[PDB]
């Protein structure tokens, strides 16, 4: 009798718990939609096993606000300026990411995460499912 | 039309002499079909100063030798590998392609074209109208 | 069969990414039939990142309904008009469709998505397998 | 120093190449300190075409992080669950590894990269001298 949405968190979690992989960063639309519930075009999740983080743009932070609940919400145009001081903050070395990502975000996120190993996942949300 | 995609094709090559641009790959069907008129997603495109090569698949083979101008059409299912042959074949060590690409698809061209370094570009075809 | 049925859709949704496909329209039985399990003919599928749609006559609308799962029913006889009304909101101006289709229905299509390029596959959903 | 090491690294590169060797992993004191410089025995290097990654732990953190040129650097106490997902992030499906470690370390490598072939080098390192 746990929610399907906690439930579907839960299995990412123990999923990264697994692998050893410290943070998560999705950002296609069906994958985040999946852990958070959120609709919104513009959303970029982090997820450690300390941190559930959604960050959004302007157009959307109430929205979320008043209806995604377990994950913090974070107002931000730079997302990946935002991961980058998460990451710093809570000692994180390691980053994985979707694989489906375009190299034009892959090419942003080296240049916010320097120093932070990145690590390209293949299907890995579509795979909890 | 065949005067206007060998234009179009000409107006390309000047863009990649002016740069420095030696070879590009073009991935992305919008693009490709603006410089061929072919339309089929299997379409892997390479263009330097001296090539025009489509890469398709045997669907396609047959159609793009009879309908597509001035480009060396070559049957492959494994266009990257074709791309690294003309690449050495040119004694070519720089390739431009899209960024738009995955980030899973430029893990695969690090696979096929060792020793090659591979510079993306935002939007350069369409940067052409 | 639903979790066969979203791994297909999955893989058509991220081979059309990877071509630059942005949106496909399948019409053909035996292609929208492996991509929604739905086995009527009166199926007009428009797939794009964003969106799932399967256009049908009445006769088939609550059945539809009931058993798609993970495409919205759109319940019309004139579903090209559907088609362009959705593209026009998504602003999508290139569609792919089967190579299949009558040259009439390419002049339907013609007709009635005016400022969208079309562009013939051979065997898209086909290839998928 | 910074010459010497450039060159080990480089010399140690070309070798691997060589022999067709995708990743090495090196955990003994003297050859980690021969390629990177580092003086602590919490460290697990690993090399690879396209990676360089010296694993330790956060008594060691900082100092690594200040002095070791051109190692990612990534603090775990889990370093052989850090080598599995870079091994799977790159896919990468053979692992070098120096003959020296102990029957217990590879039993529990062996354990932990599943589906990894793993090939005990001899010498690898002390053979760049």
């Given at each position: 009798?746990?929610?399907?949405?906690?439930?579907?968190?839960?299995?990412?979690?123990?999923q990264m718990a697994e692998k050893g992989l410290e943070a998560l960063?999705?950002?296609?639309?069906?994958?985040?939609?999946?852990?958070?519930?959120?609709?919104?075009?513009?959303?970029?999740?982090?997820?450690?096993?300390?941190?559930?983080?959604?960050?959004?743009?302007?157009?959307?932070?109430?929205?979320?606000?008043?209806?995604?609940?377990?994950?913090?919400?974070?107002?931000?145009?730079?997302p990946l300026k935002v991961v980058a001081e998460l990451l710093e903050?809570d000692q994180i070395d390691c980053l994985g990411f979707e694989d489906?990502?375009?190299?034009?975000?892959?090419?942003?996120?080296?240049?916010?995460?320097?120093?932070?190993?990145?690590?390209?996942?293949?299907?890995?949300?579509?795979?909890?499912?």
């Amino acid at each position: 009798m746990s929610g399907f949405l906690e439930q579907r968190l839960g299995h990412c979690l123990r999923q990264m718990a697994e692998k050893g992989l410290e943070a998560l960063l999705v950002t296609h639309l069906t994958n985040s939609y999946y852990l958070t519930g959120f609709s919104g075009t513009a959303a970029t999740v982090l997820i450690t096993a300390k941190r559930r983080v959604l960050i959004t743009d302007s157009r959307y932070t109430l929205l979320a606000k008043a209806s995604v609940e377990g994950f913090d919400i974070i107002e931000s145009r730079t997302p990946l300026k935002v991961v980058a001081e998460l990451l710093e903050a809570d000692q994180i070395d390691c980053l994985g990411f979707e694989d489906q990502v375009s190299f034009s975000f892959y090419q942003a996120m080296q240049a916010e995460l320097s120093g932070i190993t990145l690590l390209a996942q293949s299907g890995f949300v579509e795979h909890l499912r």
